[PDB]
Amino acid sequence: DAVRDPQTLEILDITPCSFGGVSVITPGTNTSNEVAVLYQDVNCTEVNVFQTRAGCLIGAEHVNNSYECDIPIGAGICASYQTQSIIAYTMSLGAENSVAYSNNSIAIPTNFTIS
Amino acid sequence: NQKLIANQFNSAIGKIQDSLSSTASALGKLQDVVNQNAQALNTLVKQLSSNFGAISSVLNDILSRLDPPEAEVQIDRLITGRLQSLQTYVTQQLIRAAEIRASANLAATKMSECVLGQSKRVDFCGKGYHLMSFPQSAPHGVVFLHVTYVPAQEKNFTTAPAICHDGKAHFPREGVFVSNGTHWFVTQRNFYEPQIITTDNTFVSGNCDVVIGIVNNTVYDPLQPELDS
Amino acid sequence: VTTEILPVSMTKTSVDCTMYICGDSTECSNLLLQYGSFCTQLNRALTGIAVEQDKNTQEVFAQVKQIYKTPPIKDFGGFNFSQILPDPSKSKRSFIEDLLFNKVTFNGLTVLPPLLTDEMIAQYTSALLAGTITSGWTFGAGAALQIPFAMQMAYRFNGIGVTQNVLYENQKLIANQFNSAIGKIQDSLSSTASALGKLQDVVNQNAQALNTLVKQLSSNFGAISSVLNDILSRLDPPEAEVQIDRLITGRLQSLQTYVTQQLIRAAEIRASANLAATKMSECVLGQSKRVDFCGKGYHLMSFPQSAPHGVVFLHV
Amino acid sequence: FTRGVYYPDKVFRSSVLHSTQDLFLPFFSNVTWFHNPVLPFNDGVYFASTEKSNIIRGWIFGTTLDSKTQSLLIVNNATNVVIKVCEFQFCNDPFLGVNCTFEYVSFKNLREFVFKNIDGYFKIYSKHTPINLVRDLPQGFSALEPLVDLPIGINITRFQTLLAYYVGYLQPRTFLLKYNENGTITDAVDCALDPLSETKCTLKSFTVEKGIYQTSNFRVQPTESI
């Protein structure tokens, strides 16, 4: 955990060197040979760079627009290939649709389909 | 709507054929079972080529090259590695089998409740109101075609929990009161089909001073015109 | 109102089998490779579980294709849902959800984040709750069709064999009993930490599994030393390899034990996730007629709440 | 480019992707381009040459290459290939105009060779093909079959070429080799070239489906020693 320096009477902590798994985000080689690389659970200072909770993501462009998830990274972030480059975005959970609720109104279907 | 319903059904089946023909991944669940089992055996066989600390992965080379007092030691290393490999494989097969057993139990449950009957369980037999289902065979599994009723075009109606007639509070026996802006009707809950509100559609309980949101209306009595005529 | 708690997911622990056994050691790694796929398939087994854990969360919570929202005016016929609806002034979670969260707590071992973060689960439970309150079961089966809340309850009462006139005549009483019952849930969860013991237990079992795995590194397994660097510093290869081989067998065996336990435990959690998904589909989106499926009594409705590593249902 | 691949063994494989580690020329690495210097042998040599008039005749492999110890002399003189491992005395600058333990006697073109010396055996692989290119090596892929296997028992650290040609060096890298129905290698992946190649080797497929895959482990390396 820590050692005493034999020449100087001081105590030094030993912190093992940063490491983590490396994952490659691939759009699929049928469309593109471009990939983005995720260094899991590390800071980008040790490794078009985006720092996320899941690690340091390199090569993917961060986009402010939300999209449905395609290739998941983690912690709310997914990757995709769009018009072309690899991008990262916060995933959308679904379409927003407020309900027109009131105390005197009911919606009743007038037609149906069989699926 | 029998002609409409039959046509929608027939169209939907044609869509299933196109979906299955177009995308193989539709059956990814069955392909995945096949892939995992195949991988488990490829892994098991590949392990025969490992030394596991032995001088050689080949049993015959150990036996013909080393004198028995030493060959036995090298063999014990191969036996431990190969025996351990089988134990790993078997444990994985048993755990994987538990997953498949659970799936099979679910599949059996669905066939009994979804195919042989008419389930009332929501999203048990797909999204929508379950009508019926049909089983199909498949490699190492079962495929169900779930036929469901899904509400489609809809309208915004004004409503009320009850109506006031002679001060009596009338409630629908099996429906909801609606208004198109000028007239009140009673309609079945899942399909707009307005009917004249009559004593044969509603029942009386309590009065207008109790029900919150009760509105004024006229309830038709089919008997009075007959008594008068 | 009763509370039922079901675990949905495990901590996504991922283990680097090479670093675990042969941390920063070339000589050890060369020997480890003699075991073929014994190391690699363990990394694979754990990866498969981590993926499964995200699958479990999605099957339970992502049952709605749209994010529904309640109106600014809570005109729900006297029924007070503000204790289960998200608080916009804060993490967009309800009072009860905050109570639920506050009651549950370098060896090649890392933990991956879930795909859906706590605020995203909160959005899903918010959508399901908004759907349940403003459109009953139709947001489940088809489109979310607005219905007055008191009227929705009328349907729920007929669904258990009680003529809806009972609801309207006693609407004030029913709303008051409901509001009181939710308040009781807040007090029960605030006071009794053990209320969420099922979620805490999953966390504790996984913590023990990892603590055991790490402690095994201190074992000699017949070697002169549990420390790989000491063997390498003291002995020349002709013998060092023997001492290392003893550690590799013991440490590889330790991982196999760990992974097997994680896979069996994962099967248990998966079963719970499947049950949770089933209850949400049949209990929240619909109206179950299955006895004691949605607590004691005749089922009228239920509301999902998010929780650490799982889901909590309030059954009415 | 993608050349410097040879059949690692004498085993027939078909319709299969085989992962192996051996000394291969790393893909897209630099090779020294020559138009008679003494070069290092290192762990093995990738040699390639182009011809119009059969200028390159042979090679010398050894240590001192000065009648002090044993060395390999491989020369194709007019019509007959001669291989000798004698303790030869060589010229200050050997060229061709217009104690022995082993002896054997047998731009428009490209001749590729791989020379490696492992455990006393000198392995020679080669490939011949027509070309139409003056400036550089052609881009494309082929694998070199073994031709000669000499039980020399001789240490090689340096070599020289006897008279354009290219010299590269082999490294212990993993490759994924694609075998066709006829037992030949039609493609290859250098598993340490880039992150996509790493993915292909991990999945053991020349094409990969969309998704995220774990392929390796990042480790910060020590820079000093205390």
Ligand SMILES: *[C@@H]1O[C@H](CO)[C@@H](O[C@@H]2O[C@H](CO)[C@@H](O)[C@H](O)[C@H]2NC(C)=O)[C@H](O)[C@H]1NC(C)=O
């Ligand atoms: C319910 O919707 C269906 C369409 O999904 C209607 O059927 C269509 O009617 C149009 C004419 O308006 C025709 O051109 C289409 O060919 C019909 N389609 C099919 C499949 O029959 C149907 O009439 C609607 N029903 C009600 C009661 O409004």
Ligand SMILES: *[C@@H]1O[C@H](CO)[C@@H](O[C@@H]2O[C@H](CO)[C@@H](O)[C@H](O)[C@H]2NC(C)=O)[C@H](O)[C@H]1NC(C)=O
């Ligand atoms: C509500 O429905 C009633 C019944 O269909 C509508 O009243 C009828 O309107 C038609 C003209 O479109 C007349 O020919 C009928 O004689 C009316 N019936 C009665 C009983 O008055 C009424 O117009 C609809 N209201 C709205 C706002 O759409």
Ligand SMILES: *[C@@H]1O[C@H](CO)[C@@H](O[C@@H]2O[C@H](CO)[C@@H](O)[C@H](O)[C@H]2NC(C)=O)[C@H](O)[C@H]1NC(C)=O
């Ligand atoms: C339904 O109709 C009745 C009359 O038939 C309404 O009763 C009136 O209530 C107001 C308010 O208390 C009194 O000032 C009137 O004198 C009452 N009328 C009669 C004839 O007694 C009742 O308010 C109506 N309700 C709704 C919801 O419209």
Ligand SMILES: *[C@@H]1O[C@H](CO)[C@@H](O[C@@H]2O[C@H](CO)[C@@H](O)[C@H](O)[C@H]2NC(C)=O)[C@H](O)[C@H]1NC(C)=O
């Ligand atoms: C729902 O119940 C909550 C209590 O849990 C009500 O919030 C309180 O409102 C009163 C004013 O009427 C304030 O004085 C309290 O300080 C509030 N308490 C908290 C904890 O915020 C809420 O108003 C009720 N809503 C409805 C629609 O009945």
Ligand SMILES: *[C@@H]1O[C@H](CO)[C@@H](O[C@@H]2O[C@H](CO)[C@@H](O)[C@H](O)[C@H]2NC(C)=O)[C@H](O)[C@H]1NC(C)=O
């Ligand atoms: C049904 O039981 C409820 C209590 O659970 C009764 O409501 C209470 O009535 C007393 C008077 O006797 C009041 O002091 C309480 O404040 C009421 N409680 C609530 C929540 O409203 C109700 O009256 C009973 N109904 C019948 C028909 O007996």
Ligand SMILES: *[C@@H]1O[C@H](CO)[C@@H](O)[C@H](O)[C@H]1NC(C)=O
């Ligand atoms: C995807 O693969 C098919 C062959 O199965 C090919 O025809 C198609 O062009 C490929 N897609 C792209 C974008 O190149």
Ligand SMILES: *[C@@H]1O[C@H](CO)[C@@H](O)[C@H](O)[C@H]1NC(C)=O
């Ligand atoms: C990552 O490094 C930056 C410096 O560039 C530092 O500000 C930040 O706090 C670090 N984060 C972690 C989690 O170490």
Ligand SMILES: *[C@@H]1O[C@H](CO)[C@@H](O)[C@H](O)[C@H]1NC(C)=O
């Ligand atoms: C997102 O918007 C913020 C401003 O709120 C801006 O600073 C940031 O650079 C934007 N990011 C991208 C990827 O557009």
Ligand SMILES: *[C@@H]1O[C@H](CO)[C@@H](O)[C@H](O)[C@H]1NC(C)=O
């Ligand atoms: C009902 O009214 C709302 C507005 O409150 C509107 O957005 C919705 O489309 C209407 N529905 C129908 C079927 O007209």
Ligand SMILES: *[C@@H]1O[C@H](CO)[C@@H](O)[C@H](O)[C@H]1NC(C)=O
């Ligand atoms: C419905 O809401 C309106 C607007 O707040 C209110 O005036 C009316 O009395 C309410 N009716 C019922 C039955 O709740």
Ligand SMILES: *[C@@H]1O[C@H](CO)[C@@H](O)[C@H](O)[C@H]1NC(C)=O
């Ligand atoms: C090649 O050189 C050898 C001597 O090493 C000689 O015996 C042979 O005849 C020569 N061949 C030709 C074709 O010149």
Ligand SMILES: *[C@@H]1O[C@H](CO)[C@@H](O)[C@H](O)[C@H]1NC(C)=O
């Ligand atoms: C051959 O080797 C012997 C030593 O065994 C040495 O005495 C002799 O001089 C060598 N001959 C030549 C031609 O180098």
Ligand SMILES: *[C@@H]1O[C@H](CO)[C@@H](O)[C@H](O)[C@H]1NC(C)=O
């Ligand atoms: C090659 O070098 C080794 C020392 O690393 C030596 O023992 C061996 O005898 C040498 N081989 C020859 C043929 O001189």
Ligand SMILES: *[C@@H]1O[C@H](CO)[C@@H](O)[C@H](O)[C@H]1NC(C)=O
């Ligand atoms: C194998 O060789 C035959 C000629 O004997 C050729 O026709 C065939 O196309 C070759 N197959 C492949 C896969 O190259």
